[PDB]
A paper describes a structure:
Studies on B. subtilis have shown that when TRAP is activated by bound tryptophan, it can recognize and bind specific segments of RNA.
We hypothesized that the 11-mer to 12-mer switch could be induced by withdrawal of the C-terminal amino acids from the subunit-subunit interface, as observed in B. halodurans TRAP. Such a switch could be engineered by simply removing the C-terminal amino acids starting from position 72. We tested this idea using B. stearothermophilus TRAP which normally forms 11-mers. The E71stop B. stearothermophilus TRAP mutant protein was truncated after residue 71 thus removing the five C-terminal amino acids and the main chain hydrogen bond between Gly41 and Glu73. The conformation of individual subunits is also very similar, with the main chain r.m.s. difference with the B. halodrurans TRAP (residues 8–65) of 0.38 Å and 0.33 Å, respectively, for the engineered B. stearothermophilus and B. subtilis TRAP. We questioned whether the 12-subunit assemblies of B. halodurans TRAP and B. stearothermophilus E71stop TRAP predominate in solution or whether these were selected from a mixture of different oligomeric states during crystallization.
Numbering used by the authors:
A (entry chain C), B (entry chain A), C (entry chain B), D (entry chain C), E (entry chain A), F (entry chain B), ...: 7 to 71
Write the structure that this text describes.
């Protein structure tokens, strides 16, 4: 499965997993402080990922700066 | 499954998931504030995605803005 | 499955799904207003997609405008 | 399955599906007026596609102008 | 399955499908007027395609004219 | 399955299918007149193809003339 | 399965595995001192990886520093 | 299955199929006169191909001139 | 399965295999003298590899030193 | 299965097939005259090929002469 | 399965196979004298390979000199 | 399966097959005299290949000499 790389560029960045299925809700919010990184897959339970806060992101489709 | 990357360039960008199957209706609306990102897959339940609001988008076919 | 990216360049763009199978009818018309984007897969129920109105389109085979 | 992209360059363009199987006949004719686009797959029921009228076409093998 | 793109450069171009199997005979003749295009697959029933008339052809191996 | 493209450069070109199996015989001879094109697969019944006469040939391994 | 390469650029770097499944908790924290490298897969039990501390990271999508 | 392209550059070229299996013998010799082409697969019954006489050959590994 | 190449640049480089599964602990420590190389796979039993000591490392994602 | 192309540059080039399995012995010797070519697969019965005599050889790894 | 190429650059080079499984031990040491080459796969029984002594090594990830 | 190409550059080159399995012994030594070529697969019975004597070797990972 595909994954995304998220580096926080400030404190309090939020990486949020949305549930896979007919129901869509937030199931987890991971806090990243400045400089911390989360490398997160799409999975059986996560089919969309939301990022709140200033972050540098890499995916297969390129960079978000 | 393929995914799309949506960066909101204004508050209130709406990412709308349309139901897979014989019938087509929206099943989820996810709102993004300016600078927020949604990385969203096509899934068993979502076979089309509509984006309303000023956004920067990446897919396998490149950039749409 | 393949997907197409359609950005409306004017109000009232229509993205129309044609039924997969022996019969061919329109099963859904998605109206896009100017600047809205639809990212739509080919699916069990949709084997052809018609676009009416001024639009910018990306597929695996390139850009249409 | 492969698909083709057809943009009408004049009114009254006709995209015609030919039946898959031992029998070959037209099963559907889709009319495109100037500037309209059809993105159409090969399918269980369609193994050849005929285009009548002035059109710009993209397939995996390139462009017809 | 592979497909071929045939653009007629004169009226009456004939695209001829030859039967798959131990026996070989034509099972279908599709005529194209000048400027018309046929996009045709190899299939369960068609294992060779003959083109008669002045035409521009694309296949996986490139252009034949 | 692989296919070959044969364009006759003179009248009376012969494209001959050889039988797949322990035995090898000619099962079909397709006559091409000048400018005609045959696009022919390897198949359950054809494992070698012989061409007699002046022709332009494309395969996956390049051009023969 | 995909893997990530993490080189600690200071003492006390923490590479944290998050549990695969409906629930998300930290199941392991691997402490890296300066110059140590961890090469870690995504696995049945780990579907997201968090990195705290100054580190140089390689994944399939590029370098993070 | 792989195939080879053989063009005779003189009369009396011989393309010979060797039997697949524990037994190795010639099962077929196809005569090519100057300019004639044989496009021949490896098959259930042919696991080596011998060419006698002046010929131009293409395979996946390049050209023999 | 992927593998990593580790060249020790000093005596006593430690290549440490971490257990695949719900639990994480080291199951093997392999020491390398200066100039020695270990080429090590990810496996049923090893889902993360830790390297301690000055080393030159190659993986699919490039060089880490 | 892979194949090799062997062009003899002298009379009496010997292409020798070695048996697949626990035991290794030659099971077939095919002789080539100057200019003759053998295109030979690896097979159920042949897992190594020895060439004796001056020859030009192509394989997936390039040219050996 | 992947393989590695090891050329000894001095006498007494040691290529050592480590056992696949929960248990890790040396199961074989192959001695290479100057200029000798071992081409060795990863296998059911070998999931890590250790090289002692001055050697030139090629793997899919590049060269160790 | 992968294969290697070995050209002897002197008389008495030895290409030695090592047994696949828990045990490792030499099961075959193929002597090559100067200029002879052996093209040898990895197989059910051979999981490592040793070369003694001056030789030119090609594998998927490049050339050894
Ligand atoms: N529960 C939704 C989540 C989702 C994925 N992609 C989306 C795009 C738009 C809206 C919601 C989604 C699903 O699995 O389909
Ligand atoms: N329910 C439709 C949604 C859809 C996907 N692609 C489309 C293209 C056009 C219109 C609707 C659609 C389907 O699954 O097929
Ligand atoms: N119902 C048709 C729709 C279609 C797909 N491709 C086409 C091309 C031409 C005409 C119709 C079509 C089918 O599934 O086959
Ligand atoms: N019914 C035919 C349609 C067709 C496909 N490709 C063709 C080429 C030539 C003529 C007819 C065809 C088939 O499925 O085989
Ligand atoms: N009936 C033949 C048609 C054919 C395909 N390729 C050919 C090449 C030569 C002659 C005939 C053919 C077959 O299926 O095999
Ligand atoms: N009947 C033969 C035809 C053939 C294919 N490739 C060949 C090469 C040489 C001679 C004959 C052949 C076969 O199926 O194997
Ligand atoms: N338990 C979650 C962990 C996870 C993976 N990717 C994520 C993205 C965001 C939040 C949590 C996650 C899962 O397996 O799905
Ligand atoms: N009957 C042999 C033919 C063959 C293929 N490749 C070869 C190489 C050398 C000698 C004989 C062969 C086989 O199937 O294995
Ligand atoms: N036992 C863990 C080991 C592991 C792999 N990748 C990791 C990343 C972070 C922490 C631990 C790990 C697992 O198999 O999942
Ligand atoms: N009978 C041996 C032949 C062989 C293949 N590759 C080799 C390399 C070295 C020595 C012998 C071989 C086998 O099938 O395994
Ligand atoms: N027995 C171990 C050997 C091993 C492979 N890769 C490793 C990395 C580090 C330590 C040991 C290993 C295993 O199969 O998993
Ligand atoms: N019998 C061993 C042979 C072997 C393969 N690769 C090796 C590397 C090192 C030592 C021995 C080997 C095996 O099949 O695994």
């Amino acid at each position: 499965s595909d994954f995304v790389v998220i580096k926080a560029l400030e404190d309090g960045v939020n990486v949020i997993g949305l549930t896979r299925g007919a129901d869509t809700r937030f199931h987890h919010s991971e806090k990243l402080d400045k400089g911390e990184v989360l490398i997160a897959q799409f999975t059986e339970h996560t089919s969309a990922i939301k990022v709140r806060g200033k972050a540098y992101i890499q995916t297969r489709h390129g960079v978000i700066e």
